């Protein structure tokens, strides 16, 4: 699919907040604290319930967020936890993860409190209601769970990462675990298949605590329009003889070499730990190893096919 | 994006001041503008978006904020005619190109 | 010396706001937070300054003043600091630990971060001003304070206690780091003699936030009357025969008997609280540290098992063709 | 208005305080013990000794709308209970001193 | 006060053991290993205890000591302490803190190890004992303690400083830290008021360790003898016309500014001096529990490397096979 | 080989130093301290030299030594470091690691100080010596290496374990890397072929400190006579019908059992740490990715030689 | 090893005291014997060797230490009749065998 | 014996002293500067003031057998050192009171 960055249904930093106070295109309510390098939804204190939802309504066929969160906790031991909606309305209060109840559409719940006494949480649970149905907080929904993962988000070294993705009538929810600084290093989470959502909703995010605290600090929140490759019109005739990109693509970067040259010798012109650095070593040296045992994975998957290839003759 | 919103030189001679400081009041009217097109991506990815270009023409430089209404309605006609590729994203080959 | 709790000018839980959401007798502005159990001055944000110094005029010759607070950081190295006045005029904003520079009393601070590079912080430093000196941030305002301690308060299992008590022109503070859950177990932190206050002056509690964050919450602030042993009249013949009061102590120890067995047996009728010690709500940061290390094995693991599997079927349906072909 | 006695001998009041960890309702005691019981249940540091904070705690109070009463009233109401109850001049109400009135 | 340097009871670099391998003026005894550089009073060894005390008495109504030592240890935890006596008779061996007890004096302990369970340690304790009153090990002496401070001196990257002060029967502590090379930065730590001391002792420096293992290293010990600026007499016209002080003070700039400008360029004709500087001799501990761990991983790596070449391989030829065959 | 304990030309813990102050049938001079623990065979002093040498002399065809050891620094440069010689007489003394100059046997160096300036130390050197060659101190004698290879053995977490073997005329150097508990984890380091060390000679250690100075401890010696399997004779009918072993086997696993058992509760009849054991959980982890890609190795290997035999065919 | 040297109980009855206390003053000779083949086993192997049976017969409990060349004697005269597998190690098997 | 002139004059002591750190040695010095050499190499602290333990290092010495001083013979020459040459009794001794005598 073809994506398309939408602007009004995202916020970022690091100019996250305007002069006013407020963050452009959405509307926060209840203990959320809006800074410039994130939204702070729900501080560590008890009970706090914040929310941030968008204020037009979005009208997207298939769509892709990527929300950049952390749960920081004191504990090991957290509550209540995040909630990221695509509703038909903001509720903006209420609670079901500092959110209303019987909201019309998907919520993935990022579950941080074992309610049920099963030792399932920390977990991700996808949601759906049409407007009926209580959310059941005494068991964490499992009862009403389209599908769950067990991953754990809370106090991990980098930014937790979710790609939520609805794209032909199923979501998907991938997670980056937080181990790695990389953008771009999304794992599985979860399915669910034959998804029907409404097509008016407004994107929001909430969170809510209880008794123990954690901080849940969203960083950014990017919404992308998803097209299918056949049903976009490709309106050709409008690069203009694609010669003046080849002309200026070589100039724009000859020109911020050479801004980086000079920054170069003006940083050093008028003027990291211990410890950290060695921590930052060990976490890099630990993704090394995933990455070498992954590609060894694919090269020994490589070695099943050619194999069977050949038992085929 | 009108023409002398990004053709004024002291703006940007203000911005890049506390790690590059070369004044020189000569700049040609494609290099103003790069040093606009560079210091607006702050997420280094050397594009510019919607979020980018709001934060570009309301900035913190006193006047009243803008209507959110205003504010939609004029980066949806700058996006309407640069963007070329319907990616939600500007480009220096568009912005160079419009 | 005897010493007189005074309401007016102190703040606790576990009720401290009100239904309005304001704490009462107190003026907060900034970015302080106040909650019912404690007030977060200045959250783990960057950029925050916040404060809450009381609304009437205390006037006061001498007084003990006795602070329980919490500064809360994920990295080792915290900033900005804390900080407890008594000054003439209210300090709601400014650059100075959240609090306006150009003060008339004494301020307290508590610094988290070296800013004059001598590995000297945090620390507790004294500074008195009259009104004309600015507050040397960048030198930690190593050149106007009249006294200073190298002491530790951020990232305790315990809050931390402080007392600071003006007594016969002697300020005195003292520190209880926090790592015992005693209320009484003070240690001396730093003293300045001949001290210049004013007369009348309003207390207040600040906080600040620069680059790195740190939660800076407060859960009491008492402020107590400090009288001498010699100055305080007695005013006798006013305990009304003093034998009611031993008729009634035995009734209310008895009531407390009662009650204490009474909750012995309803604690345990129907147990259904959960309950919380502390020893699952702290955890010191470098075994924070490692413990994210270790889970980044419990990842690496999986990526064996599952690829040990891939060779282990390899080996088996390939003796299969292996054994139909030979 | 203050400290009147029909205001801590009101046993609803006490009753629907002692609900969820004292767990057994009784409409026949003395207003002698409910006293006992208010001074037990507004002394939250465990001290055994009430203060101006805990009494303000305790006339203001939030029982579910009502309007709130100012902070010179408070004030009036909180010195007015000092000045002639706190007969040591410590700041804190012993029990003696709560039984006096 | 005026200070005069005391040298029969004081020993310092870097020639503090002379040819016959003892100290001047000083016995030692134990496990102490006195050394050109320093004197290390207690190994890191499991049951070691050592003392260096002196050999004639001293009589002085006031005095000062400067104590210069490193508390080296692998582990957050070290066992057992240091101590630093002026007593009436010598301390050479006994099981507090590898000294004698029962003593009639005065002695500071370092403790690093809390027996009590209080997690008030390390500190510095001020006891003194008339010489009927034993020393309470298991509870860290906190029963018979005459004061205390609760400050960190093992594992800094400067030595570690301490005055001990009686001047006007006042005995005070004051600690530098050792976070700074500076040797003029104490910090209060302790003070005892009407402190009462015989007249003539010897003084000594003790170290023991117990269970865990640290290294006690002592690198100067510095007596100084007090007197009050009323009580000293001046003894005037002993100057001999002070002229000739003026004559040679700036013939003696002048030496050695030739010295200096002389080892300027001789120090850089034939560079050959290897040089130690002070970042590559110290190292966190926790610090060296991550590197190690970093090390873990270096092994780690090289196991897959190989593994990876050999799936390599059975890539390769069989490609071959395969190419053969078919 | 058949392996025979020598308790004559060993040392070891907790008893290590007897009441008069020696350790039995070993002599120490210099700076070694020795403890009931261990033997600190160089203090962390400047200009630190000290041996501990066998009394007796050992008459061994072919043998084995078992050294345990740590090198503990404070900086991450160290000298100079710790040696294990089998010669023909007790030097005791000397500039060469802190024993004599000439020896006439085989010498493994610890050298933890790199002399040369080529980045190869720490570094485990194998130099033999008729009694008439210096050791080159200057550049680590990469000149008269028989064999070397770089392990690092300073400041690891576990004592560092080394396996010397002289069986039929060839010397095997085999190290424990020191980041595991486990007292048989040994790996290859170097190796040499017709070495001739006389039959009669000392066995012995020392260590020596430069201006870097490191604690340079030896927790246990243990010397193993190596025979051959044909040449030793069986000398039978010894057994003493084989039986009584059998019939005391079970009672004493049952006693030991028992034994336990009693331990077990009167451990709480009348009575680790945070950090600690997660460090220890860390190296246990490091260590079970460890076995598990050696283990996928040998698989591997396997697959290898079944696939060559089919190949055969 | 006489058989008078391990079969004495106040020695191991004051050894085992500390960590397991059962005074009994009734053990048979296989018991205290089995005991003394426990305790004096500090590596935990279950084995005996040449040094572990050198520190039990000098021990710490005064008397002058010991010559060496009588312990090497006596030890090797110990080890030569004892020791039935010549692994230069001592088993109960053996033990209990001599 | 003492500090005598001899002692600190002996210009071959001084040249095999300043070895390995000065090399320059030149056999036609005056009796003056010496003195100041032997002053700047006996001081180890750096802050240019003799002490009795610097004086102690000196007169003892290391220089390559010979017998040692006994510990009350080398008292009594630092007593009479600090007696007759410390005019201000702080202990320590200036380049003044050295070129005194
Ligand atoms: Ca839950
Ligand atoms: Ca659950
Ligand atoms: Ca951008
Ligand atoms: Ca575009
Ligand atoms: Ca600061
Ligand atoms: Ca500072
Ligand atoms: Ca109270
Ligand atoms: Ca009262
Ligand atoms: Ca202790
Ligand atoms: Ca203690
Ligand atoms: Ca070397
Ligand atoms: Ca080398
Ligand atoms: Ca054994
Ligand atoms: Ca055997
Ligand atoms: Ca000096
Ligand atoms: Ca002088
Ligand atoms: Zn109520
Ligand atoms: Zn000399």
């Known amino acids: ?313 | 994006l009108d023409k002398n919103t990004v053709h004024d030189q002291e703006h940007i001679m203000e911005h890049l001041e506390g790690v590059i400081n070369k004044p020189e009041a000569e700049m040609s009217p494609q290099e103003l503008q790069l040093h606009y097109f560079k210091m607006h991506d702050y997420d280094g990815n050397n594009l510019l978006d919607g979020l980018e270009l709001s934060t570009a023409i309301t900035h913190v430089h006193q006047a009243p904020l803008m209507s959110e209404d205003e504010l939609i309605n004029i980066i949806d006609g700058v996006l309407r005619d640069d963007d070329k590729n319907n990616d939600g994203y500007i480009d220096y080959a568009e912005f160079a190109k419009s």
Chains 1, 6 share one sequence.
């Not at chain 1, 909630?83 to 559409?105: C, K, T």
């Not at chain 1, 724009?252 to 930052?280: A, I, N, T, W, Y």
Request: aromatic fraction near 10%.
């Open chain 1, 1 to 313: 699919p073809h994506r398309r960055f939408e602007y009004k249904y995202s916020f970022k930093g690091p100019h996250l907040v305007q002069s006013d106070g407020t963050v452009p295109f959405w509307a926060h309510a209840g203990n959320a604290i809006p800074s410039s390098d994130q939204i702070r939804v729900a501080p560590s204190l008890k009970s706090q319930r914040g929310s941030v939802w968008t204020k037009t309504k979005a009208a997207f066929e298939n769509w892709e967020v990527e929300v950049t969160f952390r749960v920081t906790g004191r504990g090991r031991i957290g509550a209540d936890g995040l909630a990221i909606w695509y509703a038909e309305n903001q509720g903006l209060e209420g609670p079901v993860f500092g959110s209303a109840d019987l909201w019309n559409g998907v919520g993935i719940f990022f579950d941080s409190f074992d309610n049920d006494g099963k030792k399932n949480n920390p977990a991700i649970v996808i949601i759906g209601n049409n407007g009926q149905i209580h959310y059941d907080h005494q068991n964490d929904g499992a009862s009403q769970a389209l599908a769950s993962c067990q991953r754990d988000f809370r106090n991990k070294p980098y930014p937790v990462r979710a790609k939520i993705t609805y794209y032909q009538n199923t979501l998907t929810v991938m997670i980056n675990n937080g181990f790695t600084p990389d953008k771009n290093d999304y794992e599985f989470c979860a399915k669910v298949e034959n998804m029907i959502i409404p097509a008016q909703g407004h994107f929001g995010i909430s969170a809510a605590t209880g008794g123990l605290a954690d901080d849940h600090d969203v960083l950014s929140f990017l919404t992308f329009q998803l097209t299918e490759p056949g049903k976009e019109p490709p309106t050709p005739d409008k690069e203009i003889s694609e010669k003046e990109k080849e002309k200026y693509q070589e100039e724009f970067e000859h020109f911020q070499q050479e801004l980086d040259k000079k920054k170069e010798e003006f940083q050093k012109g008028h003027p990291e730990s211990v410890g950290d650095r060695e921590l930052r070593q060990v976490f890099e040296g630990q993704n090394r190893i995933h990455l070498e045992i992954k590609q060894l994975n694919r090269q020994l998957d490589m070695i099943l096919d050619e194999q069977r290839r050949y038992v085929s003759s």
